[PDB]
């Protein structure tokens, strides 16, 4: 699902 991959 993630849209900001470095966060999540």
């Amino acid at each position: 699902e993630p849209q900001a991959p470095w966060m999540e």
Epitope: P2, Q3, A4, P5, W6, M7
Partner: antibody, heavy 117, light 112 residues
């Protein structure tokens, strides 16, 4: 369409705040992450901030010491960038962008911010 | 702090020929989830950047099949076959596997 339109930026003195807005249209705003990126000539592109669907989680370029705040009015379809304690290195063209799966698939035309006395 | 290094800085290409642009990252861009968040953008003169290729090889809507992205790990290549004048401008690579950073850009120049 698709379309993001940044507000007028312009001239700001050091230490003062200024707030950019970005009007989004043509997609369920609370269905996309959004981001700000900036470009200085001679420096290239720098990711400034991003925000998830409802504003509960944000990311900021660390070196902005919490002086920038990204936020979104879902009711009005508007993305904001509040820039507090403005500094000279913040002079740049700021682009509003839509973020999907790590990439920026829609960009605004950009607005320039000049920090000078 | 992941550095994206692009070469060459400027690339002169005759119309109809192929242009090849290199983007290298200072750390692997393979995310723990298995995806590689390496993308390419084109900024034409007086315009904003626009997405060209996402996730190493996926063409964005409206991008001709002659733009092709490849690579893995830390080494990536954008290939433009049969170059047309309207391709000119600055190509940027971008990674978002890690704290997001951009390459310095490669300026495509058309020879005449």
């Amino acid at each position: 369409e698709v379309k993001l339109v940044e507000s007028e930026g312009g001239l700001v003195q050091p230490g003062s705040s200024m707030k950019l807005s970005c009007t989004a249209s043509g997609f369920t705003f609370s269905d996309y992450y959004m981001a700000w990126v900036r470009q200085v000539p001679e420096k290239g592109l720098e990711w400034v901030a991003n925000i998830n669907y409802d504003g509960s989680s944000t990311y900021y370029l660390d070196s902005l010491k919490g002086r920038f705040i990204i936020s979104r009015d879902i009711a009005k379809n508007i993305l904001y960038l509040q820039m507090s304690s403005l500094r000279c290195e913040d002079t740049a063209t700021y682009y509003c962008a839509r973020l999907t799966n790590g990439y920026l698939d829609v960009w605004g035309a950009g607005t320039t911010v000049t920090v000078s006395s | 702090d992941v550095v994206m290094t692009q070469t060459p800085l400027s690339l002169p290409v005759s119309l109809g020929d192929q242009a090849s642009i290199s983007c290298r990252s200072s750390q692997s861009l393979v995310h723990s989830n298995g995806n590689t968040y390496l993308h390419w953008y084109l900024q034409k003169p007086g315009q904003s950047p626009n997405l060209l290729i996402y996730k190493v090889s996926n063409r964005f809507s409206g991008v001709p099949d002659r733009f092709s992205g490849s690579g893995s790990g830390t080494d990536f290549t954008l290939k433009i076959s049969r170059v047309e004048a309207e391709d000119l401008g600055v190509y940027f690579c971008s990674q978002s596997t890690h704290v997001p950073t951009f390459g310095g850009g490669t300026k495509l120049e058309i020879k005449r």
